[PDB]
Symmetry: D2
Subunit: 333 residues, 4 copies
């Protein structure tokens, strides 16, 4: 008995055909709206990043053997509970690191070349040139990459190709990046010296609100800050207060705290926070780009997410766990 | 020596006044067509930018002119044959910052490919959903075709390679340095047929005039992205417009376009307007078109370097130290 | 006596200090909830505006208070029962300019019926064509329903009559002057079923609370236009939003709405936000909706008259001259 | 009888085909300039709209023509002198809906005086605050100047009286009904100097050509609001633009403007464009300007009535019953 939640409509037929041998229930809605009689039956659930797999929810799933998330991130799942109950958790670590790294650079270039402000001028038939739209060049700037994993290492490499000085912060210091010119530094040194800072760490207890009041105060006046990692890596209240004081040349955010309320229109069922309003206000500024968690959202990513998802599910029904060993977050035993 | 500067932004006037203070210097923020005849007659060296149209008719009114310096890479605004006939020297600035334009080109390419204008429209309407109208493509799955691989175009090709793009190149000079990095030089027709993103980096000449015309556009893939940061007359704007309306393009990025100067200098306050002005204005509002007002070059670094190189050319010339600025000559001695 | 002014715009501070220079005056641009308790305790006359919540809990801390003057028509933000049991007098400004709000209502009705917001979107895209998507209706062919025919609503009904509209009127009190001009007083349910445009002009009370709710919206014609310049809580925003999403309305014009103060005063900078904030922000983007930030009253004459009436009331109260401000009492002697 | 219809909207085609199937009817959705010469020479009756230019040149190609019917109030697009000289009859529709245009006129006035465009800009940026940049004015404090008190202008004056405006009027034909309602006729110069809002409602003729020019605009109050729903050529667009840039106006509202047909019919698709197109496009983007694409008339009742009157005129002419359509004649028999 296989359960899929938060599946877009157009994937519904693809998963029915690809998994025809199995007993499969598919919901376009999230797991909190699935009836308890279907939760009780599920041996394998497949979710995405807005399905909160809390202890409370997972307790209603006594037959659950494996959770597969169609994502790189897995911070939406209570792993400690899964470890203690013997539930396996899989993910898709590398459907397309390029998608997010390319999106990150799209935002950096959009901001540094002031494209949004130019577009506002052009709409007013203002084709003049003046200092309000005077751009900077990447080759004169320092890029600070926080997290040099699959996505961040690509961001670091695009930086180098543009002639940027590249600083890096990670617990794992990569030879390949060092040989190419990147310099690994303390967090405090990266925050102080960078002109463009970009976040590429997972959300964990250690990265929780790591960009906070204190860290933001260490950054250069006029820094550019990009977040394509997770919203809760950044203290949105501190971000907003700093923006209002003019701290930033620009902000690029593809992820932000309480995003799910906007992205899934949960305000139709009573939800809202001050952080939703803060983000909507920022979104209107001419030196801010907010995108709705779509850095991954390319044709290549969606094709790979399908492929890998089908592979993990078939592997598990046959018991061939060796086939999917690179997919485990919580593996055997 | 009597030195005349035209089209100088007011913010640059103090700089040139101090740097050239021991010359007989006259500075106009307006363009050369607006300069009084009594000033034109006296001038021995003029420094212009790309909207100062130095035609035979205008140049005839400057009987003392010895050198034209354009604060720019491009010199298609200058009647060189007339200059050669008359013995007028012409300099330019070949390389203040090729990176400015190459970076801008990629800014536009990524804007279009990640559909950021469309996304921004949705976010404004509180539409934070995801669906196929905003499904992006990846650069690393695409072929870039660079038309012109000079200072600017070669850098664009290298950025393309660094994104994992297949890069096709067209130029009359085939650079071994680009071949060895992975760029493949092809015929024009092959580049047009196979490229998903095409970017133009050739000068405007009689040979590149409407090079991108109805025929060449029809050879492109449906869904191509076309970028122009070279000169507007390299592309037939009437044919580009008709093609856009038939849905030929995934996107257009234009920093330069025919008749741009009417919009950029607001010449419609003096009675000027063309159909291409209205066509570009209509395209500017589409969610898959980016139009910028010839500002690919307009960075802080470019401006610094344009200042420095222009002051070096003027001082060299007044001294007679011509070998010092040999790299700046378009029409050199003698 | 000790006079306390709250929510005074910075631009008005020098005005009031000068007018009331003879008194012991404390002015705040912030609201009453952010005034220090020692100043709350001294206060014998307090002047406020509509976002100052004079709750029982807040009025508890003002043991020396004799008079509350709100610089406004509305007084729903003031606990009148608590004032009555404690002997606190309450004044307001009943008629600084009902024309300001009635003109605003009509600006909204005309905006929507003439589809100006949609036409503007088209024009911004250089779309100057004509088609059924901007085909307008005429007011002279429509029926207006006016709910509340007081100082503001009666003027709205008269504007409608001048436009050749059939005007239906609903109020707890019938007016002969309006009937003689041609308004037809009817029951609420008849007005709701027969009006093409419905506009609200009642005060917020326990009886008007969510007066426009699910049931009553369901009585409206499909395609009705609904205007609210009264008070936000007269309409159930959730039922409104739901009906809107099903296509109930040709248009909506809201100058007031539930939880408006969170947006108007940016209280989200201190943690506040509701789902009604997001519903209104979403509606605000629609091309058949106009949302304004409670500014129907906000004209130059209004502000002038509010300043004048306010010094009048304060000076009359500090003298014993209660007759002079007889018309200003909401809760009078004794 | 050979009947020719030009500039017919596609959705009207079946309707006129059914209405006139007893006749030899040729229907085009394009303008008269794009009708083949063979068809122009057959035509006994022609029905056109305001963008069909019936110049002497075009009419001279129509030897068999007895009657031109324009589906419009306006007839400045027909060379009347020619028609008289040659005995050609000319009808129009004088009163399908003067209320449409008069209501549109007040929709623009109210939009401008209540600063709705600027408020919408603020609301879009989540700025729901109140300050002097959105302080509105009140109509009832202002003087309206109506230039042209015909069918449309007279209604506009009446609405103004309904809003408590002092109404000044200028026309060569005085109407006693308007004086009896409280309108006051004055000289042009006095109307220009004294009015806070001015609205134009004259036909286009030699005498009204550029009526509103540099000199007339200079007589207006600084801060004036100017509206035009008459004809673009009544206003000197260049003078209006120049005055706007000097800060002369609190607002402008234009439903008609010089060279509008290039934008409205997209003639820039065929190489047309003028400076006034670009000036209008620039003004359209300002927050105190509303431009609409000649749609003041464009209401469902207007379209219904234009259809009915056009059918009656055609059916009458073919039957010879000229007495029926006596009210429709611009140029009547002999
Ligand atoms: N915006 C999007 O569309 C989208 C799409 C995919 C992934 N993501 C996010 O991006 C994240 C990164 O993805 P990835 O594929 O690069 O992951 P990764 O695991 O390959 O890289 C993360 C890097 O962060 C480092 N790191 C973790 N904790 C750290 C700490 N506290 N201090 C210093 N370094 C630390 C790791 O050492 C690793 O190098 C995901 O976890 C997910 O949250 C977002
Ligand atoms: N948008 C902007 O702000 C901006 C700024 C600077 C330069 N430009 C434009 O970019 C152009 C290129 O600048 P660059 O510095 O790269 O110049 P470059 O001279 O270094 O490069 C030009 C290249 O074009 C090739 N070429 C010329 N004519 C050709 C033809 N007929 N067919 C095939 N190849 C041809 C040459 O071989 C050369 O490789 C300039 O001439 C200028 O017009 C635009
Ligand atoms: N948007 C704004 O800027 C703004 C400005 C001023 C006033 N207002 C609001 O408009 C309201 C009306 O102002 P006004 O000057 O017309 O006041 P008003 O007292 O003259 O009119 C109120 C009318 O509503 C009627 N009414 C009261 N309760 C009713 C009920 N339960 N059912 C039917 N009718 C009822 C009364 O009989 C009266 O005729 C104010 O109370 C205030 O809430 C808004
Ligand atoms: N914007 C639109 O959608 C649209 C629609 C219909 C009509 N119109 C325009 O509005 C005009 C007026 O329409 P109407 O039905 O009121 O016409 P009308 O003929 O009833 O009124 C015109 C008035 O102008 C006056 N007038 C004419 N020439 C004058 C002059 N030289 N000086 C002073 N007064 C003069 C006449 O005396 C008359 O009172 C039409 O001719 C047309 O151009 C525009």
């Amino acid at each position: 008995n296989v359960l899929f939640t938060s599946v877009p409509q157009e994937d519904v037929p693809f998963y029915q055909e690809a998994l025809k041998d199995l007993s499969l229930k598919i919901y376009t809605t999230d797991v909190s709206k699935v009836p308890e009689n279907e939760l009780k039956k599920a041996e394998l659930i497949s979710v995405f990043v807005y399905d909160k797999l809390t202890e409370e929810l997972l307790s209603k799933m006594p037959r659950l053997k494996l959770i597969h998330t169609r994502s790189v991130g897995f911070d939406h799942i209570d792993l400690d509970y899964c470890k203690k109950k013997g539930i396996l958790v899989t993910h898709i670590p590398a459907y397309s690191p390029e998608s997010v790294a390319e999106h990150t650079f799209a935002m950096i270039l959009t901001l540094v070349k002031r494209l949004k402000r130019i577009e506002d001028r052009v709409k007013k038939l203002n084709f003049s040139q003046d200092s309000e739209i005077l751009a900077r060049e990447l080759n004169r700037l320092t890029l600070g990459v926080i997290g040099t994993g699959r996505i961040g290492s690509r961001v670091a490499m695009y930086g180098l190709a543009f002639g940027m000085k590249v600083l890096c912060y990670d617990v794992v210091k990569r030879e390949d990046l060092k040989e190419k010119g990147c310099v690994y530094t303390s967090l405090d040194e990266l925050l102080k010296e960078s002109d463009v800072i970009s976040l590429h760490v997972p959300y964990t207890k250690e990265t929780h609100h790591m960009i906070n009041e204190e860290r933001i105060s260490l950054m250069k006046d006029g820094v550019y800050l990009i977040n394509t990692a997770r919203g809760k890596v950044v203290d949105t209240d501190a971000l907003y207060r700093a923006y209002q004081r003019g701290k930033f040349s620009g902000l690029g955010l593809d992820v932000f705290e309480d995003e799910e309320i906007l992205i899934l229109k949960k305000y139709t069922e009573g939800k809202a926070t001050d952080k939703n309003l803060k983000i909507l206000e920022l979104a209107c500024k001419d030196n801010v780009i907010i995108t709705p968690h779509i850095a991954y959202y390319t044709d290549k990513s969606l094709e790979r997410i399908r492929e890998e998802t089908v592979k993990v599910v078939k592997a598990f029904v046959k018991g061939d766990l060796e086939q999917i060993k690179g997919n485990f977050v919580v593996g055997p035993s």
